[model samples]
Target: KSVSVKATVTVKLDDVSDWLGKTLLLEVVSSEVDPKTGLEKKPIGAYAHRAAEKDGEVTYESDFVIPDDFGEIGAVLVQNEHHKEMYLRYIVLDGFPNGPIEFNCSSWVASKFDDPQKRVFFTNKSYLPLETPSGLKEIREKELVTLRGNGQGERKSYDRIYDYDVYDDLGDPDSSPELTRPVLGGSKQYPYPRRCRTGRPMSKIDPKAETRSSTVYVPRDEAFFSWFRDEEFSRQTLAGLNPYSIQLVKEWPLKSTLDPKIYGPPESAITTEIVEREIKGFMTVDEALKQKKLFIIDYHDILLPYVSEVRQIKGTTLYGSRALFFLGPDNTLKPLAIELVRPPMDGKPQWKQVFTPSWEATGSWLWKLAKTHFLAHDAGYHQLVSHWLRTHCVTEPYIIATNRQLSAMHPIYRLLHPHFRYTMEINALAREALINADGIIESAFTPGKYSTEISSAAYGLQWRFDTQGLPADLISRGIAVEDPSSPHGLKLAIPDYPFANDGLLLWDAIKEWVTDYVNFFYKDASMVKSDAELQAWWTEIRTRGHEDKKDETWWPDLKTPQDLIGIVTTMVWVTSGHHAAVNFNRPTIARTNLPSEDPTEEGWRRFLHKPENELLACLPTQLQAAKVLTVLDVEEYLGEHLEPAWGADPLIKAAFERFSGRLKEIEGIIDARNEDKNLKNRHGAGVVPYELLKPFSKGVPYSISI
Candidate 1:
């Protein structure tokens, strides 16, 4: 004989006020392990309750009868559109519980092990880590407390917290250059007031202060939770860190365009005819192109344009990284290889293999990978990722469509909620302003809308575990303007990166170099040089740059503002853009390797032997050499032109003002870092030394082996 048992689940809503007005899809699911994969999946069974009303402090009761032949009943699972988790109440096999099983939703996670009777705990969002790690204790500890009225009394207790004292043991407050900025005074010094800690200013008691503390709070209704931290939660959070995310979609060769997957699988056995025809002389460019084996996917033409929109031109040089894709069966793109390309110098392209081709199962991870790569690298891609990909593609869409069923659902649906949508938007704008048509140096130097935008984004979106305060921090040297429409009417503080300070030191040194170049070439009635010698030097650069082109000359006329713009543009490209491409990307290669084939110790030795790879490895030293020669070329051009016409050109005036102002701004950053006791050799002289170049320097000899 079989007995019928009824299980009643009572969900308490008092602890889950954050999830008010949100739908909670409750159901019972049976957990079963896969025979082959050994993965456990709880297939959803029956609907328990529907949470549609906004009523607070209400208990939702669900009752269900166990089927006699169902054997052992599994745990009840509560979920939203994206994330789901199991709730094991008194799943009594022998007898029914004395009362209804109790559960509460607090942090969106199931609070199951909290109490014997309640059996409630929070469920983990698929994207975020289940628990806080020790590394993020400092940043994650930015706590906010509210004055919840203790009893029905007039006098209320206030919750106090201390902020990171940016101006504690760093020299004299009055004389410190960083302290002198108007924004660092009185109330403007810190975002929040500190009184709980000794020797800190006290915050006045006020009833109206509705403070939203800096704690990472996950709403019970929200599918995902995240907080600000020094380290990213996953490699995906940082741009270009994960290659798997950027691989081609498996369903490529879209079904709408073709019937069957067009590409065939890799042949198990190689034919002699195919080998003899292809491997004769290591296929030339024309032979490789004719074979139709390699499918060319230009990131600029096919992918990036649709995803990114910025003021600056999207080019290969910007990222300092390039990638390739190999295809398998069913149009399956595999072993997505990544490579590093030297910024096209003197109108020539050169690339060396960085990572071996490797493939992985691709899907949503590819979308995320592509999105983050662009966000972290390109200005336009950053905006697109922040708004479109992050909001919609990365997040799941939910629709009620009557009470019959949940129309749509995703495991990681609420990757980043709409609540933090504005934060991303603000971040996008800041990054956009960082590199514009005028370049980072020019944009940062002149105080106008660009500086205002930087400050606005910083003030609007404070640093969190997710939001890095880089753009705002870099431009802190420039005064943040006040506007009624701006968020908080204040600018943000310095960021964690030393680039801003490093840029400043470079700004000063470059200015000096420019002045020296100008004096050596254009000094009035002081230089002594033969006309033939000067002409010879001019001819060398002119021949190398504009040998065949006739529309416009590459050689600087040094007379009009256009000529000056050309010179400055080239200098900026080498110092900033080119500098970033070579110096920055080499480190990324060293850290990240091919996932499929970890280059063996012998393979590593062979890789280092390659001159091009070796050149990149020792590029910092070579880069310094290139800068020196580049500056000398400018000096030669300026010296050759005897009293060239330099009229009151507006462009020249603007350019000079920008360069001068940039040097001034950077001076302060460098000084601040130098004076700070904690920072030693950390921010090295902030100088780029100029030296002679070697014969094999700048990857000239081994330009194209791959």
Candidate 2:
């Protein structure tokens, strides 16, 4: 049997508000009760050891494992332990930018269940491997589908969600030759006349057919990238990427392709094809290459429209000091182009506001409304870079498959590979240095800012997306093939669910897949365009079938013929593809307003100690009119089942009652501020929505102070 406790501590930041990373320790203060009556003191054993200070407020936890013999444990006496590391200096103004710890301590009675076969409910049940529908065996299904256009299916709707045609491969197998998209340079089509098994044409696999798993298309020596054991940097690199957005499908069931074991090498076949050398390929290539480098940066509250001293330009500045940059802009940046991946409004609102000067007769007078490019804000930079690249350079032309450092690459690397190679993946050590200064860790904002525009945010010779060779699947779909007679084409699609923020949503969805800690993944915004794109994508999904043009998103709905076909086609591919586990990752949650149980409240005091008395607290005058629940209200409700468990331990029971009472009050106030109309629109429930009892708050509070 185990007894579980939930404590809530509160910290007041009266003097210092800039204690962003200042560490403070919490501990159990003296526990002496009234000698006359022999009762232990309040708050016996609950406080934080240390907490990381950030943006004004912080909270920490000292979750101690209690022993069974601690009588009928009531409440604990928690307070600041007055550790040496704790300091506050306003001198250089570097004083922790965010600290003033306030936490709560909530306790619960926990006992091992007698029944072992308890059912578990999880969010990722859809992806979980379960018993197949009746006798339908879990056989591997792999189909080669060819398209007739640039690409298809990238919309978010219910019908197109599962509409997939051409999955049943046609027997008219064609040879795969060298190819590339002339306009997009994404290698949209694959030309053929290359070596085929038994000296024929490259073939396609049939879906309405059966094949064995042992079949490989090439008996070639392939090296899978795996970090060497004990290699810290390499291990961290992979681990860091484990929880990122736009994840590469990690695990999937194997299906049979042409047997590579019998196909040998294609080195002999390329000699027969005639090739022409280019005098630097195209003039645009030279012009684009000249723009040697580019830099990018973005953050939540970088004070947009605020004038900068050096640049003498007013712009947004997220979090006062947080800023992003686009350094090497000599190269062409990609134009923004992509459909919303999913349905409407389920994500965060990607809003970009302009600075309109306010002219108050008595006080304020600033510049008139001169709207700056709100386009430069948010994740828009990502799409901008993509468009720049697509317009100028070819798509992932020279990708180096092996985990080789960029410094070791050959100067004249080409896209073709038996083993021809192009760009090299920057080494983990180098990559880390370019980003993550490894200072104080806080919320997702710090890490997110660094990941996108700082580390790998270039599209020049220094950094670029993979465009090596077309994936067999995508190339097979494009209709603009070498053979003019081909009837189909291809387009790529990515459905977006209606979530306000992709990073946040993706993190929530995939966090459980990892071992030890789940919120340890790094998010890279450079991969996707911006938050608005996410919102817009979602809005598109919600009103796809509606005729109301005014209610539509910036992007047209899948109403047009091309749009419908594109969205529907993409959905088909996504649904038909093998289902893989989605992993989420996040940074450590800082303590400012920790969510725990408070023992001082009346309801909890009586619930834990004199639980028989239905104790409660009055509404704080500020919220009295709203009919908010007091601490006692919550404690009484929870206490109905908890009171019996405390048994005869008067001290433990009394203390718990007070603690629960406090939590009840806090939870009520919070809930009122949220669901209750009047309050929610005002104070906005502060950090409670981000980390507490709400729709998106799924994580437990594990406060760490550094």
What is the per-residue lDDT of model 1 for residues 1-706, given as tens digits with 9 covering 90 to 100? 4333433333333234433433343444332344456444433333334422243333333444443433323334444321222222222122333332322223233332321121112222111111222222222122111111121222111111111111121112233332121121113322211111112222233211211122221112321111011112121211221211232222222111211122112111212233334234544423432433222122321221111112132221122333333322222222232322222233343222233212342322222233223233333222222222222211111100000011001111121111122222222222233222232312222111122222223222232211112222223322123345643333322121233334334434444434543443333422212222223322422332112211233235544333333343333323232232122211101212221123477755655455345324322234333532342232111111111111123433444455545544544555565455443323224322111011112211111000
lDDT agreement of model 2 with the native: 0.21
Compared with the true structure, model 2 gives a TM-score of: 0.17
Model 2 per-residue lDDT tens digits across residues 1-706: 4334433333334124323323222222222234455553332334343343456534454454433333322112222233211212110101122322221122110111211111111110011012211111111000001101112332211110111111011111122211110111111121110110111122343223112111212111111111111122111211122111121111111111212242212121101011111112323322322332111122222222111221121111121111111111221111111100101122322222212223362111101101011222222222222221221112111111111111111110110121211111111111122212221110122222222222112322222111211222223322112333432221221111111112222222212211101111112322122222222332422322111222323332432233322332222111111000110111111111001112357644444453222111110122221221221121012212222223223543454455445434444444454443332212222312311221222211111000
Q: Which residue segments of model 1 deviate by more than 4 Å? A: 1-213, 216-280, 295-297, 301-395, 398-706
Q: Which stretches of candidate 2 lie over 4 Å from their true place?
A: 1-182, 185-509, 513-706
Lowest summed lDDT across 10 adjacent residues in model 2 is found at 139-148
List CA RMSD, all candidates.
Answer: 32.6, 33.0
Residue 541 CA error for candidate 1 (Å)? 59
Q: What global local distance difference test value does model 1 have?
A: 0.26
Candidate 2 versus truth, CA RMSD in Å, comes to: 33.0
Give the lDDT of residue 400 in candidate 2.
Answer: 16
Count of backbone clashes, every candidate in sequence: 21, 149
